[PDB]
Every structure is written in C-alpha cells, then in structure tokens.
Amino acid sequence: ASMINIISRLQEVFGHAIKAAYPDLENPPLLVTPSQQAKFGDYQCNSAMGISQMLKTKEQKVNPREIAENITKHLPDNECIEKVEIAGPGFINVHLRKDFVSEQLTSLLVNGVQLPALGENKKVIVDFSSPNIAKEMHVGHLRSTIIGESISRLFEFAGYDVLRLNHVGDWGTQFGMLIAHLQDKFPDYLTVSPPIGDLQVFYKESKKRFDTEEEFKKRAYQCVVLLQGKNPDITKAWKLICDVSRQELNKIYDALDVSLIERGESFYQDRMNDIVKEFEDRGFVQVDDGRKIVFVPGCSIPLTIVKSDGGYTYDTSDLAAIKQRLFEEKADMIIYVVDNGQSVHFQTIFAAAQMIGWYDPKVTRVFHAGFGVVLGEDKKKFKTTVRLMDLLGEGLKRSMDKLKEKERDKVLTAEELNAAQTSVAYGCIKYADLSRNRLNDYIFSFDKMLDDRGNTAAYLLYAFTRIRSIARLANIDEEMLQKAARETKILLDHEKEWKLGRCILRFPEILQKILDDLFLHTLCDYIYELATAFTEFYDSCYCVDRQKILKVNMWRMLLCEAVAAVMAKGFDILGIKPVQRM
Ligand SMILES: N=C(N)NOCC[C@H](N)C(=O)O
C-alpha cells in the first residue's frame, strides 16, 4: 500500500479549501507543519499568514483570523481530519482522525515500510567519495563517501534509479613520476606484475627523485604526455599502479558497506578532446599565456581547459563528465558530494554548462552537496595525514573495549565478535557525521560519538535492541506478530501512545524534505525524536505476576514493531547495520 506523506496530503486539502475561499488568488502559501506540542493539534497550517499579506494594500490590512475562517469554511471532506482550531492570529490547528492514524500504523506493519515512489522513473547520478590515486584517501574523502552512500540510498528507497560513480583522480600529472619510477624500480612490469608495497612509500620515493634528479624530472613529464597519448607500455604501467591502489581502497569501501562504479577522470580522455573543440567552435574560448581558458559571464574565475603545454585539466574532465551524464546517461538529476573548498569550481562549471546549452536547470536538477572540513577537538585541521584504515581499526578497538563491560559473556561469538562491535563502530563513524549539518565543519571525536548516552549511533543502536527485546522476551515470534497485525485494531487512547503514533507516520514527510535539501541530519534528528517518543511511551504504558505473566496488550506489541520497522529503514538509509541483541 505504502506510507502517506501527511504534510503533502494536508497541503492538497487546504489548496482545495483555499481555491474555494479565494479562487481569484494565484499561488497562495500552503505552509503545513507538524505541531510540536500536544494541545495545538498534530499539524499546523500557517497559510492565512501569507494570504493576508498578498491581499495587503496601501491603506487596508485584512485580518488573518477572518481569512482562516473563510478557509476552514470551505474545507472539503477528507479521510484524515477530525476537527480544526484557530489560535492567535490565523493559525489553523489540525486534529487527525484517530481511525486514520490507526489504520496507517497497521498498513506499514502488514505491507511494510515502503514509499509510494514516482509516476516516472527519474535517473539520479551521485558523484561521491572520489579519492586521488597514489595519494592517501583522506577524511574529507571519507565524508563524501559516507554522505554519498547515504544520499544514494535515500533516492534508491524513494524509487529513483541511482548511479553511484566514484570519480577518482586517476589522471593526475603525478603519475608521470610514478610510472617513470615504476619503470626504474621494476623493469619487468610488462611481464612480472610488480610487487609495489605501500603506495605512499613508493610515491615518496618518486617525489624525492623528482625534486632531486633533473633528468628524471624531464622523463616524468614525458611519461604523462605519452600516457595521454594512450601509449601501450606506459598505460600498462599506469593500470598496474591504479590496481595496487584499487585493492587498498576496497578494504575501505567493504568495511563501510559502499557500492561504487569506478569512473575516474581517465574515463573521459576522448570526450575531453571534443569538449575543447565544442567550446572553441561556439566561440567561448580565449587564449591567455598559451592556455585555452573560458570566461563565464557572471563567474568570479575562468575555467582553464587546456594548459600551455597541451595538457587537459580538472575543468576539462568535469566539463566532459557533465556533458556525458546529461546526454548519454540522460540524467534527471546529478549530485556532487565534494568538500566545500571546491564550491566556486562547481558553480562555474554548472554555469559553463548552461551557457553552452547542455541543460535547462528548470528541467534538470544539478546540485553541489557541499561539506565542511574535518577537525580535531583543538578546532583545527585533522592530521598526524591519517590513513583511513587506521582510523577504522582504532574504531573497532574502541567499540570492542566498551563492549567488555561486560557483554562478552552474554552475547555469543557472532553476536559480539562482529555483530555488536562492528555495527557500533562503523555506525558511530557514519552517524556522528550525518547527524550534523553537512555544511558546518565536523569535529571527529571517538569519545563523543562512542558515548553510550545522548544522540549517538551507540545509544540509538542499543535503544533499538530494547524495542526488539520487548516482544522477544514476552515470547511472541514473527509469525504471531504478523497475524496479530493483520487482525488487530491499534489503540491510541492514551496520550503518549498518540504522540508515538503520529511521530511514526512522519517518516515520509521527513524523507521528502531531504530529497529537496539533501540535509540528512534531519533524519538522524528524527530517529532520535522517534527513539525518545518510545521511551516516554514505555515508561508509562504497559505491554506486559508477582508470582510470570502480566497480560500482553497485543496492540502495544505492534506499536513497538512499528517503531522498530521505521528505525530499521532510517538506519538503512544512513548506512547503519543494526543488531538485535548487543
Ligand atoms: N569533481 C568530481 N566529479 N568529483 O570530485 C573529485 C574529488 C577529487 N578527486 C579530490 O581529490 O577532491
């Protein structure tokens, strides 16, 4: 059946009701918001607010309370509204049908937590992680990965078709010295696949030679020209270096549970040729100091698309990239998950793209999802540079250390030696990030994100186990619960079970908002809000003598399951893999 965006529903029935009360008005505000207080109803409509101000005139100000009246007067029949109240000025407070909420709570237990999805299959392309080959994958790359994996999942769950592209820096000029060095240190690479160790100790070996030996430097620069010329021997040496890089990288994408089509800058070697010609032939190119540059009317900087020496650039690659994503992949939306240091870069690229006619931003969504830098607690850059695998190993350890109080004796081997340990570590590292606005800088603290209390993954993961233990400890297997759900009316007479009930149905309205601003932290803020609504429900209501059985209220067994299902999905979107026991 799939869940209902209640906010979008109330917006439909108010726009019907507003068109009736003021049909001569054009595009009136349909600001419907959840009431975050018991008395004011379950949703609020602040629409007589902006409607009064549209009718405002030099010497006449229509009082909003009289509008709200004229609005409620024409409210159609529905399936979700009990009564309507007017407070203050023209606030319209809305009360939901208990029946409606109950029926909806049920529907997601039998049909399950799934979204309605679309009437057209749009194609979202998400550009994330993107480390630079031969250089360490750094924490800023980590954010992108985490944020990108989660964004990809939100659209995947929303019914979109999603292309996860790892746009890796595998076409740098630094390959020159690596390849030239590889040919020195391992003169049989063509035949004996060379044992290159740590790619960082190798790179170091090169930049020394580069900065030291002048005849080596020239060789290095020549290798780049030869590589771009697609030379057989030189290219093989390149493939082999990216190979050693690729398998160290997968160790990380594996641990963080991340799927990615690798499609580096090198993928566009030929399109770049055509792009340069395509900008030339439309007269957008200007020659400055031997560079072919492009000025975009409005932008603070120019794109360099050919250097003085014939070599392409980041701008060249990202121009080729957006043309093919728009034309061959035929995307309806493109998302770039890249550190905010490069904000200007994408606004100029996107501009350049409109300028040459590649897309109509009214029609195709192109979006830079930016993020702040990673800091230590001393509120400056995060360094020691930190290897990502080290960070995670140091996460796994710490996660384990916590668990030794004293759960190594309760949970069995699997439930703990992985399940709880890993699900907590990786879960915290993702959650600490996503729970904070992606734009603000991020303070990476093992101590803060591993805290057993507060707004951490740790608390919410533990919290999850308790919701699951309830119907477990009272011995009600899945088979029973599914039959209960199919036959039980769900009861919401008690205040705190009404809070929890409508909090639950807010899941769609939450995710929709995130499809528009890509602010995932409002989902974490929702998992915490849901999680807290539950405790307040549990601490007063009974689900389950002073001898054994305190009777089972089967409908509250289902409430617990509703809460569980929705947290389960919310976790999945965020990239958290919850355990049951811990
Ligand atoms: N420009 C695109 N498509 N992705 O960003 C690439 C990130 C780059 N490799 C870096 O090191 O920042």
Q: Which two tokens stand for residue 355?
A: 């300028």
- SS3 for 443? strand
Residue 168 Cα, ligand 1 centroid: separation in angstroms? 6
What are 474-477's contacts with CB under 8 Å, separation 24+?
474/543, 474/544, 474/552, 474/557, 476/552, 476/557
Closest CA to 317 of 179, 220, 172: 172
Q: Which two tokens stand for residue 287?
A: 């020659």
Q: Which two tokens stand for residue 121?
A: 């299959």
Closest ligand 1 atom to residue 128 Cα is 4
Residue 339 Cα, ligand 1 centroid: separation in angstroms? 9
Residue 34 Cα, ligand 1 centroid: separation in angstroms? 39
Closest ligand 1 atom to residue 131 Cα is 9
Contact between 140 and 188 under an 8 Å Cβ cutoff? The reply is no
Residue of 128, 136, 167, 345 to test ligand 1 pocket, by largest number of atoms within 8 Å of CB = 167
Measure the CA angle with vertex 254, ends 571 and 412; round to 5°: 65
Q: Which residues line ligand 1 (CB under 6 A)?
A: 127, 130, 132, 167, 169, 318, 321, 336, 338
Sorted by sequence, the CB contacts under 8 Å of residue 361 that are 6+ apart come out as 350, 354
Contact between 26 and 36 under an 8 Å Cβ cutoff? The reply is no
Whose alpha carbon is nearest atom 4 of ligand 1?
167
From residue 252, alpha-carbon distances to 141, 256, 426 in Å are: 11, 6, 11
Distinct helix (H) and strand (E) counts, the chain:
21, 14
Contact between 293 and 303 under an 8 Å Cβ cutoff? The reply is yes
CA 370 to chain centre: 11
Closest ligand 1 atom to residue 339 Cα is 12
Q: Which two tokens stand for residue 371?
A: 């993020």
Contact between 10 and 18 under an 8 Å Cβ cutoff? The reply is no
Pairing of strands 291-294, 32-34: unpaired
Resolution (A): 2.8
> DSSP characters for 273-314?
HHHHHHHHTTT-EEEETTEEEE--TT-SSPEEEE-TTS---H
Distance CA 317, CA 303 (A): 11
Q: Specify binding-site residues for L-arginine.
A: 130-132, 141, 314, 318, 342
Contact between 164 and 260 under an 8 Å Cβ cutoff? The reply is yes
Residue of 338, 346, 348 to test ligand 1 pocket, by largest number of atoms within 8 Å of CB = 338
Residue 169 Cα, ligand 1 centroid: separation in angstroms? 7
From residue 28, alpha-carbon distances to 18, 43, 63, 512 in Å are: 8, 18, 16, 21
Whose alpha carbon is nearest atom 8 of ligand 1?
130
Residue 129 Cα, ligand 1 centroid: separation in angstroms? 8
Residue 35 Cα, ligand 1 centroid: separation in angstroms? 42
Whose alpha carbon is nearest atom 3 of ligand 1?
167
Sorted by sequence, the CB contacts under 8 Å of residue 163 that are 6+ apart come out as 123, 124, 125, 126, 261, 329, 331
From residue 251, alpha-carbon distances to 255, 420, 432 in Å are: 6, 20, 21
Closest ligand 1 atom to residue 169 Cα is 9
Exp. method: X-ray
